[PDB]
Amino acid sequence: EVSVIKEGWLHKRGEYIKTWRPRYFLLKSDGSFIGYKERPQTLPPLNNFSVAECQLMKTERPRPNTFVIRCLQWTTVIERTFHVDSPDEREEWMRAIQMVANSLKQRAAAEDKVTMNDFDYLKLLGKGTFGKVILVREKATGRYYAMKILRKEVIIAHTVTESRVLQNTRHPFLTALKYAFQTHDRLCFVMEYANGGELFFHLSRERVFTEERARFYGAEIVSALEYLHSRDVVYRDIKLENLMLDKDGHIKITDFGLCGTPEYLAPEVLEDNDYGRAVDWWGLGVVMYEMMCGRLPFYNQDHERLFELILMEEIRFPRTLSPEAKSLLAGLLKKDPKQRLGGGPSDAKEVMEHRFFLSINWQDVVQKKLLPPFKPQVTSEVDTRYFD
Numbered sequence: 001e002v003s004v005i006k007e008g009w010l011h012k013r014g015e016y017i018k019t020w021r022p023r024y025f026l027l028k029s030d031g032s033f034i035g036y037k038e039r040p041q042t043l044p045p046l047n048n049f050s051v052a053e054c055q056l057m058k059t060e061r062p063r064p065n066t067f068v069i070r071c072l073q074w075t076t077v078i079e080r081t082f083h084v085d086s087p088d089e090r091e092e093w094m095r096a097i098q099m100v101a102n103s104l105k106q107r108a109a110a111e112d113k114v115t116m117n118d119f120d121y122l123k124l125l126g127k128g129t130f131g132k133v134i135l136v137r138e139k140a141t142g143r144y145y146a147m148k149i150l151r152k153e154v155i156i157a158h159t160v161t162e163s164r165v166l167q168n169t170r171h172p173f174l175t176a177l178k179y180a181f182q183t184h185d186r187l188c189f190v191m192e193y194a195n196g197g198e199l200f201f202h203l204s205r206e207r208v209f210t211e212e213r214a215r216f217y218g219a220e221i222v223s224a225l226e227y228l229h230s231r232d233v234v235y236r237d238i239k240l241e242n243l244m245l246d247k248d249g250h251i252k253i254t255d256f257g258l259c260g261t262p263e264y265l266a267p268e269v270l271e272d273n274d275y276g277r278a279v280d281w282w283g284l285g286v287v288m289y290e291m292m293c294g295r296l297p298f299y300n301q302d303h304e305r306l307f308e309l310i311l312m313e314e315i316r317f318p319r320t321l322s323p324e325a326k327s328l329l330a331g332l333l334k335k336d337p338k339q340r341l342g343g344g345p346s347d348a349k350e351v352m353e354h355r356f357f358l359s360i361n362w363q364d365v366v367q368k369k370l371l372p373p374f375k376p377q378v379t380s381e382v383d384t385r386y387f388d
């Protein structure tokens with residue numbers, strides 16, 4: 001019986017637009033902590049909103065009586081920042097959230113060699129607030145991986161956190177975890193790294209993909225998004241720079257984020273609304289628009305003007321785009337998430353059934369039986385041709 005444990009107004013700092021907005025939050029016994037524009041028994045809340053295993057901290061900047069929920073979601077640290085009027089209300093909120101996180105931990109328990117000197121460290125792939133990602137070579141074998149390194153003091157404040165190597169994604173087009181280990185100071189996630197080049201690189205040179213090429217990539221992404229949504233997980237990071245090709249030409253969605261790019265923000269995410277699975281279909285629409293038209297659907301140097309277009313401007317197309325493509329993209333880029341293709345109760349099913357994908361056998365997709373339309377110029381998984 002899923003019950004509200006605490007509800008009320010909070011000042012929530014925007015996740016991208018760093019601004020404070022009052023929102024009405026419900027902390028529920030299933031661990032979800034979700035905020036609404038007004039005070040609204042429901043379908044599966046997304047794990048993105050869960051307080052399970054989170055760490056709570058008090059701070060007085062930029063305002064007194066601020067608190068932060070910090071969670072390790074898979075391999076990524078997520079932070080949500082809140083503000084209340086008085087230190088008593090902050091305490092009551094933090095104690096209730098911690099209570100729910102304690103209950104969930106108890107329920108989960110009731111229901112259910114490798115070191116840093118084993119790698120060469122070759123190139124920094126990215127760096128964020130909480131950790132970094134480095135291209136490494138495993139010394140014992142010569143294979144290449146991306147190592148995400150995070151400081152322990154961030155979400156431990158921990159051998160149990162090595163159990164991600166079990167809840168590991170099996171999906172062919174997601175990034176799998178090879179090793180997870182800890183040092184005295186840090187946690188290290190060694191994940192696969194595709195050596196077929198960044199899709200941003202391939203699209204930049206080819207200028208524009210044929211519709212058949214974009215359909216192949218889009219279908220692999222749809223299959224990956226179905227898998228994540230079936231686990232109650234939203235990716236929220238779909239963009240060209242998070243898509244790579246493996247040695248055979250299949251998609252790999254990267255898991256390299258660290259605590260954005262405004263041109264990909266869905267309308268409901270700009271207004272700090274309750275967003276859901278529909279934000280991933282918006283993102284698919286933007287990257288498939290990029291692949292088939294060679295440019296972004298909404299762009300402006302002035303971010304105030306960009307937001308207007310994303311919120312307000314109707315999407316326009318080149319007339320050489322097939323009608324099936326114009327229809328897919330207009331459906332994926334509907335402003336209202338409830339009217340968006342894939343935003344309904346069947347989720348990915350609505351997208352998979354669109355006429356643009358009529359030729360796709362979705363079991364061939366997930367079984368990697370579709371012949372890639374482009375084969376990267378690498379002959380093995382250790383060919384470093386694309387590493388610069």
Ligand SMILES: Nc1ncccc1-c1nc2ccc(-c3ccccc3)nc2n1-c1ccc(CNCCc2ccc(C=O)c(O)c2)cc1
Binds near residue numbers: 047074078079253257
């Ligand atoms: N292994 C994979 N390879 C490729 C893609 C996805 C996975 C994967 N596998 C997964 C397995 C599990 C859970 C999981 C999720 C939630 C709770 C518990 C578990 N997530 C899993 N993802 C996964 C989901 C989301 C991301 C990226 N998020 C960025 C979020 C953010 C927050 C704040 C801001 C602010 O600005 C921002 O910009 C972006 C990466 C991987």
